[PDB]
Structure 1
Amino acid sequence: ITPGIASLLTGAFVLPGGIIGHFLGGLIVDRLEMTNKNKLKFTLVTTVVSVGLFLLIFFVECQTTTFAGINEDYDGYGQLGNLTADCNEYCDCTTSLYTSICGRDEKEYFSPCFAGCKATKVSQTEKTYYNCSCIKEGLAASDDEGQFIDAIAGTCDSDCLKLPLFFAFYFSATVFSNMCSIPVISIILQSVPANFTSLSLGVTYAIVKFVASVPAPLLFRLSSAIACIYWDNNRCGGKERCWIYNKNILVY
């Protein structure tokens, strides 16, 4: 999914679980005037089923999906990194913004300009590439109107249905998370005297940014390259742009 579009998918869909998770989660204690023993039982089963939802998502990852590129050396015509062939130089392709483009053989080609496309006519609602030289025979039926034969910009996906299972499982995990927050924060008030509740928020809030958010990116960053091993070693230099975010290792 397009990185700009992919960012939207989480941004526009994690909130609807989150907002009611506090709203339904908070109102459970508020309406029932839940006790300290009651909330602890409330938090446990809240999280336990959530983890099995995360576990359910993990089971979903097992199912196979269409694969584009990363097909080891380009059909025997060049190796990973051949990518810098003649058609790279003429249309001035740059190894940082490369995107995958689909050929009519269902084979996924990266860097639409590297596809050898010496001409590109762009319509109002789509981007398309013409005279695509560095393409292989491909091109079984293809199509077009004002022009004949050409390859269409972006990735081609035929089996993205699993997506509705993924969010659906993602929503209910998110809701359970936001109704775990209220029980923990609600209890903190009870076991502290009224004059000392002012310093109560500061104690937990100090752990929020330092103990958690300072070591976290480094823990991600080390394991981010663990699945992004295949960095663009030819141009980018010191790990600026990867090409193989390991679709099996990152999931695990």
Structure 2
Amino acid sequence: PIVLPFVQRFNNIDGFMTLYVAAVLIHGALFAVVDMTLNIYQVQFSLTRTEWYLMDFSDYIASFVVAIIIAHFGSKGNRTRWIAASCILMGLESMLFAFPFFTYEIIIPGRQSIELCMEENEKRNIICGNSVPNRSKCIYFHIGGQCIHGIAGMPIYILGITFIFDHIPTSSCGFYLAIGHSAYLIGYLLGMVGGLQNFQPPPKEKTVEIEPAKVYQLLQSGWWKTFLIIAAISFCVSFMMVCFPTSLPGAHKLRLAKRKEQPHLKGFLHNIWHILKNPLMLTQAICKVSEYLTFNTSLYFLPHHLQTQFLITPGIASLLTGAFVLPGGIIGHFLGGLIVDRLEMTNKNKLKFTLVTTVVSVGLFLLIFFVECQTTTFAGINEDYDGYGQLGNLTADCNEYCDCTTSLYTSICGRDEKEYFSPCFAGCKATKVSQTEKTYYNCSCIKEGLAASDDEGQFIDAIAGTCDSDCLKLPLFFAFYFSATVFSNMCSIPVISIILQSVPANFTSLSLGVTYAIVKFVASVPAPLLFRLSSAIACIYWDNNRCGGKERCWIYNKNILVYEFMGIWMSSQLIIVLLNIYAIQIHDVVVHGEITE
């Protein structure tokens, strides 16, 4: 008996769009939290990188195997019911991911393993690996969570854009696509910010070795809070959207205005035949594949590039790459949508516009390479430690005294402008710590040094972290990355607008699924293998003494990595340019044939 004007306004198209923005925002937040949660889980819980790759590919293959089936299901049934079911499965997924971080928080603690480790011994706390037991259950939980996450998240990005395509005019389709992409982007930002504001240790960062144990407790506690909050929000959104009627009044009015003036396997095969016969769709699909490949490569590579070239600490480098890939991206998406919406862009003009954007992006990438051709301060790789020992003298008496592990070696900076790996191996057996800075005392394995330094209460103080004297190229590179992100995010909206034009209204549901299958299978499966091959080509000097099977390198060759990644990016962009220059002629031929003026 709800005949309220609140309902009569909530069934409007803007009412649907508000909850779609909220759902895309919470999906982006959950995905951004989940990715770095899996990364820190793999870093902390004593596993190998191949398993991280496996449970990262599990989400992608689940999305691939759910996309076509959910497009086929929504092509015949109500999209709202499937969206609500996906949101319900999403809310279940968030709690299923939260459960291991609260039930199984005693897998690998600092000292809480009282059965096989004792407090008075330091060596016995890092051996007798009972953490490997009760970890396979967590692996099963995480792989199931990734599977249900893909199965519950994909249909959304399919059916919401299907709703936009089938019940919004093209004058606002670009705006809705742009604000949906911006909602996903700001969800990524907000999720990473909430994750990194709690996973990072409190201002008591530099206390005694109960600090890793309390950080280990705190990060799982924070994930347990955040995932239940996300699950409650998703369940509330699902329940609110369930109350929405199937027959939308605004959609029915639009259909009545536009009326004037069985998905069978054979129909599926005919549709695939039409898709393969029209080469515009193939060109746009490969262009989207290359754009996604370039975006993912840049996102995965920029923090590592900052560590190896600008000496940017991992989390700070990832924070920089995140927090400065969004302001360009959201503005580019908004501009790309708004240009088409305000100016009523045509298909040939869209192709020319995308070609111009890709050309200027290629020029900007060339400028980025030219800037990277400049030199910078070099840390390490000084062709053996000044003649005292070889590459492999890191396991000295100074290393053996304080019991350092090679998997967490940081960079110290002496006062003679020489940077040394393993600050504890640098000879410093005393560590007195200030409130805002880490430093090392009484260093004996170090060189002469002691040039200037600075202290008040003592002396012989080696500061922690990587010292930098010429880091002014970073803001320039960040501005160039702003421009590159703008022109990369601004290319995608005209492609989707092109995709809308060539497909009739009744079949517009399956086009998004067809494109998204190539997005997640053809592009997303071999790209990490290619990235690992390039990374193995670059990181020749692996830690073969202890680390073994290529788990942690130390010498990341800046010139080789820059040259290879820029060659890959230039090849992808030139492939996009060639596809666009083919598609311009193809679309001109098709238009001339269909017009025959």
Query: 8 Å contact 2:412–2:419 — kept in the other structure?
Result: yes
Matched residues in 2 for 1:52 and 1:230: separation? 34
Q: CA deviation at 1:227?
A: 1.0
Query: 8 Å contact 2:427–2:446 — kept in the other structure?
Result: yes
Matched residues in 1 for 2:480 and 2:369: separation? 10
Q: Classify the secondary structure of the residue corresponding to 2:349.
A: helix
**Among 222, 227, 245, the residue aligned to 2:556:** 245
Matched residues in 1 for 2:362 and 2:389: separation? 45
Deviates more, 1:210-219 or 1:147-156: 147-156
Matched residues in 2 for 1:4 and 1:22: separation? 27
Match of 1:216 in 2: 527
Match of 1:59 in 2: 370
Q: Deviations over 1:110-160 (max 9, x none)?
A: 111011001011100000000011110011122211111210111100000
Q: Classify the secondary structure of the residue corresponding to 1:251.
A: helix
Query: 8 Å contact 2:384–2:390 — kept in the other structure?
Result: yes
Match of 2:475 in 1: 164
Q: CA deviation at 1:51?
A: 1.0
Matched residues in 1 for 2:465 and 2:404: separation? 15
Q: Classify the secondary structure of the residue corresponding to 1:138.
A: coil
Q: Classify the secondary structure of the residue corresponding to 1:157.
A: coil
User: Number of residue pairs matched?
Assistant: 252
Gaps of 5+ in 2: 1-311, 564-597
Deviates more, 1:157-166 or 1:136-145: 136-145
Q: Deviations over 1:213-250 (max 9, x none)?
A: 00000000001111111111101010000001111100
Q: CA deviation at 1:79?
A: 0.7
Q: CA deviation at 1:85?
A: 0.7
Q: Classify the secondary structure of the residue corresponding to 1:194.
A: coil
Higher alpha-carbon Rg: 2
Matched residues in 2 for 1:134 and 1:153: separation? 16
Query: 8 Å contact 2:361–2:484 — kept in the other structure?
Result: yes
Q: Deviations over 1:92-127 (max 9, x none)?
A: 111110011000001001111011001011100000
Matched residues in 2 for 1:100 and 1:222: separation? 26
Q: CA deviation at 1:199?
A: 0.6
Q: Classify the secondary structure of the residue corresponding to 2:429.
A: strand
Matched residues in 2 for 1:136 and 1:64: separation? 26
Matched residues in 1 for 2:377 and 2:490: separation? 36
Matched residues in 1 for 2:541 and 2:365: separation? 28
Query: 8 Å contact 2:377–2:470 — kept in the other structure?
Result: yes
Q: Classify the secondary structure of the residue corresponding to 2:318.
A: helix
Q: Deviations over 1:152-182 (max 9, x none)?
A: 1111000000001101100001000111000
Matched residues in 2 for 1:228 and 1:129: separation? 29
Q: CA deviation at 1:68?
A: 1.1
**Among 66, 71, 90, the residue aligned to 2:382:** 71
Structure number having the greater strand percentage: 1
The TM-score with structure 2 as length reference comes to: 0.42
| Alignment RMSD (CA, Å) | 0.7
Matched residues in 2 for 1:149 and 1:239: separation? 36
Matched residues in 2 for 1:175 and 1:211: separation? 25
Q: Deviations over 1:24-64 (max 9, x none)?
A: 11111110010011101110001110111111110011111
Query: 8 Å contact 2:543–2:550 — kept in the other structure?
Result: yes
The TM-score with structure 1 as length reference comes to: 0.99
Query: 8 Å contact 2:443–2:460 — kept in the other structure?
Result: no
Runs of 4+ in 1 over 3 A off after TM superposition: none
Structure number having the greater helix percentage: 2
Q: CA deviation at 1:72?
A: 1.2
RCO higher in structure (CA 8 A, sep ≥6): 1
Matched, 1:84 2:395: yes
Matched residues in 2 for 1:225 and 1:9: separation? 25
Matched residues in 1 for 2:478 and 2:425: separation? 34
Gaps of 5+ in 1: none
Identity rate of aligned residues, in percent?
Answer: 100
Q: Classify the secondary structure of the residue corresponding to 2:467.
A: coil
Matched residues in 2 for 1:6 and 1:164: separation? 13
Q: Deviations over 1:53-87 (max 9, x none)?
A: 11111001111101111101101001111011110
